[PDB]
Structure formats: C-alpha cells, structure tokens
Ligand binder design. Sequence first.
Ligand SMILES: Nc1ncnc2c1ncn2[C@@H]1O[C@H](COP(=O)(O)OC(=O)[C@@H](N)Cc2c[nH]c3ccccc23)[C@@H](O)[C@H]1O
Ligand SMILES: O=c1[nH]c2cc(Cl)ccc2o1
Lengths: 325, 333
Amino acid sequence: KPIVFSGAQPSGELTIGNYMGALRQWVNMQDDYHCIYCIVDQHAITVRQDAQKLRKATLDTLALYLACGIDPEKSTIFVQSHVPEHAQLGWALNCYTYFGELSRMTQAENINAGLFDYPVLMAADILLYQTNLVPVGEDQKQHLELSRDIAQRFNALYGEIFKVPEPFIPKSGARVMSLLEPTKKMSKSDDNRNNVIGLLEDPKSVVKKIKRAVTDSDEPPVVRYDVQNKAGVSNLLDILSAVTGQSIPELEKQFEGKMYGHLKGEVADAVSGMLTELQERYHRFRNDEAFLQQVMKDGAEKASAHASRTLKAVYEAIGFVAKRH
Amino acid sequence: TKPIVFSGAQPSGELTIGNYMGALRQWVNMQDDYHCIYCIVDQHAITVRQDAQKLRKATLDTLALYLACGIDPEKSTIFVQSHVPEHAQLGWALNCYTYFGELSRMTQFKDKSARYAENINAGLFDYPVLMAADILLYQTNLVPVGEDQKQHLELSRDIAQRFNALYGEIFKVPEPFIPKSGARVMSLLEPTKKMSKSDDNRNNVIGLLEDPKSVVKKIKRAVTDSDEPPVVRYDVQNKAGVSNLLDILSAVTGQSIPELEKQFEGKMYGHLKGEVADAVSGMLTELQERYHRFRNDEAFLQQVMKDGAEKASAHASRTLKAVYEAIGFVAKR
Ligand SMILES: Nc1ncnc2c1ncn2[C@@H]1O[C@H](COP(=O)(O)OC(=O)[C@@H](N)Cc2c[nH]c3ccccc23)[C@@H](O)[C@H]1O
Ligand SMILES: O=c1[nH]c2cc(Cl)ccc2o1
C-alpha cells in the first residue's frame, strides 16, 4: 500500500467543508493506503499562543479526527512531539536546504525563526515515513515542492534514502462555499464565523447560520443550480447534496414550486442530522482520557518504529557515529 | 549539587592550538571545581559539507583528543551530540522563541556564508539556536569558549531570559567563561585573522595532531614586524605577530606577559620564536603520545560514548519534559 502523510493542525476547528470534503474522502480509503495522521504541535508553536489551550486543542483535534472516522487500528494517528525523529531529521535536512529556498517562500527581522524554518520541519515530517503521497491545498504546494527537492538532493549525494513524495491529485468533489460570501470557499480560518458551520455546532446555531445564508432576488424564487447567477442557492444545494447523497437534478425536482425558506429548513436539518452522530462520537472520545492516551501511545509507537529506520539510514549516510544503545 | 559547565567542539577539520587555548585548556581545569559536560557537536559540523568517512573519523579523533588533553570520563560527561535526540528537539522549540534578525546579524553566519557561497544552508543560519539548545538542556551555569563564540553565547542568554519570563524558572541563564589570554589565537602568516582549523593555507595553523617538526618550522616563519631594533613587546595594533607569539608562549608555559617581556628584554625575535617552538613542540609531543593510546582503543571510545550519552540523556530529558509542559504539549506516555 502507498504511504500517505497528512499534518493535522491543533488549532483549527473543523468545518463541514473540511469534513464532507477531504476528511470523509480519506476516511473511506483507510484500507487502500497506509495513512498517517500527524497532529502537528511542533508546527503550531511557530505562532505564540496560550499553553493550556494548545494542550486542549491537541486533544480536541485527536478526538475529532477519531469521531470523523479515522481508525487507530487501520491508520497511524499520533502527536508530532511524541516522535523525536521529526526534530532530528529536521535538523539534518536544515543542512541540505538552501537559505535562499526558505527566503523565497511566499510569506522581517521580528518574525520568529520557527516561522521562517518550518518548511524544513514539514519536509522531515513527510520524508521520515517513506511517504508516497501527500494531500496538499494550494497554499502547501511550495512546501511539498521543497520536500521533493530536498529528497532528490540528498538522494543524489547518498543513494536512495528517501522516497520522492507526490501530491495526491484527485480532490474530494464536495463543494462547500461560505454562507455570506458564496464565491469564496468555506475555510476554518475565516474571521466571519457566520460564513462557516463548525462540526460542534448545535441545531439552534445551524438553523441561525443557514437562515442568514445569502440567496438571490429572483422572482419568483426558484431552486435551480447556477453558480454564476445563483451562487447562494447553488451552495445550499451542493451542501444538501453532499449530506444526503441526492443528486442536484433530484433536489431541483424536489424543490419545484418551493421557496428558499423550504430549502434552508431542509439544509439545516440535513446538516444537523449529520453533526449529531459526529458530536456523539466526539464527546464520547474526547472525555475518555484512557482511550485517548492509548491511541497516542500506540500511534507514537507505530510512527517511531518507521521513523527510526529512516533516521538511522540518514545518519549512516551523513557519517555520524552510531549511538551506543 | 555543583554548578554545571557545558561546552562543545565540532568534529570538522583538525583542532588547533587556538581551540586548545580558547576552550579545551579551561575545560580540563574546571573538572573538579564544577560538574562538567563536554560535547562533540557533530550536528553543528554538518552545517559545512563533510565527507561521510571524514566526519565519522573526525568525531572519534575529537573524542580521543579530549581524552588526550586530560578530559576524564570518571569526572566529566563526554558525549556525541547526535546521540542525544533532546538537542534537536529543544532546538526546534527554541527556534520559535528566536527572532530572524538575531540570526541574520551573526558574524559567524556572515563569515561562513562568504567562505562557503555554494552552500549557504539553513543549518548554518540556524546554527545559534541549536547551540542555545545544547547549553540550556543541561541547566548550564558556565560555558567555556573562545572569543569567537561570544555573540552566540549572548543569544543563548537572551533566549533563556525570554523563555523564562513567559514560563518561569525553566532554564538557567548561562555565563561565558572566556580566558584572559589565548581567547583568540591568530594565524601565523596573517595575524589579523583568527587561527582557523580549516584554513586553506596550512602554514597559518598549529594543529594539535600535527608533526612537531612541521610546527617548529611554521613558528620560525611566522610574520612579525619591521621594528628597528626588533623589540619583544605585546601590542596587537602595531605588533600583531609578536603579540600572538607572546600570547601562545604565555598560555603554554603559564608565564604572564610582563614576565615574558622581562625575560626577552634585550632580545629579538629569534629568542621569542625559539622559546615558543620549544614549548609548543614539547606540549604536542606529549599530547600526541597519550592520543594514540586512546585513539586506537575502540572499546574504550565506545564505552566513553555509551556512558556519556546515558548521563547526558538523564539531564536532557528532564529539561525537555519541563519545556514541553510549559509550552503546552501533551506529555508523551
Ligand atoms: N583561534 C582561536 N583561538 C581561541 N579559541 C578558538 C579559536 N578558534 C576556535 N576557538 C574556540 O574553540 C572552541 C571549539 O571551536 P569550534 O569551531 O568547534 O566551536 C564552535 O563552532 C561552537 N559553536 C561549538 C559549540 C556548539 N555548541 C556549543 C555549546 C557551548 C559551547 C560551544 C558550542 C570554541 O570554544 C571556540 O570559541
Ligand atoms: O535548532 C534547531 N533548528 C531546527 C530545525 C528543525 Cl526543522 C529541526 C530541529 C532544529 O533544531
């Protein structure tokens, strides 16, 4: 099975876009690939933040990934800082990364060195596990390209130590746009929280956010799919289709002679119907301390076994004297 | 418990009389008075591109050389940097409390960048952060280094103070221990330039493992000055070469500059160089004699590395656990 690496940021609260897009896609491919989910707490600290909230958010993220259906018995899920090899390989790859490559990243004296240097750590995160495939958003494409360049550069000097990773090209295909701005994709980082539906929102909050969702001034109101002229209504249809599995033409027929109130009502009920099973699993996992501790221990153990084999090969190539165990 | 001493040296090139006088001499003398921890910094060495066989051999050379100098594994913790993962771990964490501008302004990064233009790498840039992690891991009170490491030392103090101010007394604030004499030994044919163990021109350098005969010849050819009459007087601005020779003689013999100036009153650079060459030849002959006994005893070197990494790991894991708890990581099981 090809090895797939994903970094999970411990800060973002996941939206229905994150879930019905990438996450649901990957949950159903856990037997197809050897999937690795790394909760990236070492990446998080490049932004100064409250310590207790970082600890909490690491555990929130673990429980939510578990709730969404990541299976600890099929996939490897772990906390980045629990596997020292990340930092170790990161230092080594720092020495085969050009300073120029980091300064050319699309992102002066007062930024912290972590924010400058984290694409090297990202390269180490991927290359440690002999990763074949990395799912990346547009913003992470430069970083993946750097990891490929580093891998090839090191391999040219020392032999085939690393796999050259490839982007995971096919996208989930569920379209989820922002509620008050239907041209912009729904993103966890959005400042306007009314643009998004988080995975932990109760039915009252979802009704409220969906009721405010932008539509159009068509007279009579008509539930028809048209991204150019009816962005808002189209987004509502795409969300409803994503939840229920009903086709757009089927939904267009279902809402014949119906107004946007009826659409919104069903969108809110559909979305909340999806989130209640998800929230039940989340709160059950999140408050089982022993379960979460066991997932983290098992995950770190699986990760370290793989990571240590790569690091040993890297260290031997560079020429370091092997540790006396 | 005793205050803690920590210092390191790279297994890159062959250590010089400069490395000895600025660092290793002080290391040896601090062993009973403080709890001393000495590191072969192989992770720092690779910021300059090394041949893999050269690096491995130089790591072991450097270890045997510490032992030959009088570093005693019964008194001091002696270890190889890459054997203790906590250095890289804490290094990453401290990256996040270090500013870009603090690193770009470093003289060492600038000098090494000019020298290795085809390999201006991120490790070379990030050099001081790993060095701060090396020091701060061991609750270090004193850091014996040469003058050239002063700026790096100062940043490690700033990082420690900065981190402590947010999170409490996690680190000790280290202090530099730079000797009065021999802190900046200069090149023999270019006494305005620091003696570098990887100098292209070997005649600039007195290597610790260099044939004494070769070293005596280098001392006789060291540049002095045009003063008429020749006078042996310490004066860095006007008499760089003569001063460097005096500095070297002082550090080997133990005699002060006034004592040496008095000794050479009415004498010229023949006497100065004759004495420097004799003192240094004798030191290197004896040093190299103990060195080969250690260097060819692989079982002893293996045991020293094993015991040292064990002792180091005990301290390092303790500090890292506290750092991780403070910054807010979920503790490993
Ligand atoms: N010409 C000279 N005259 C006098 N002293 C000199 C001369 N050349 C070098 N030194 C000193 O020798 C020690 C080792 O040099 P390195 O280049 O390995 O030194 C270096 O490159 C350090 N970054 C290694 C290091 C890594 N981590 C540490 C933590 C604490 C102390 C030191 C370290 C140093 O003390 C250096 O100041
Ligand atoms: O000091 C440092 N810088 C580092 C950068 C990476 Cl990616 C990893 C470890 C490090 O330690």
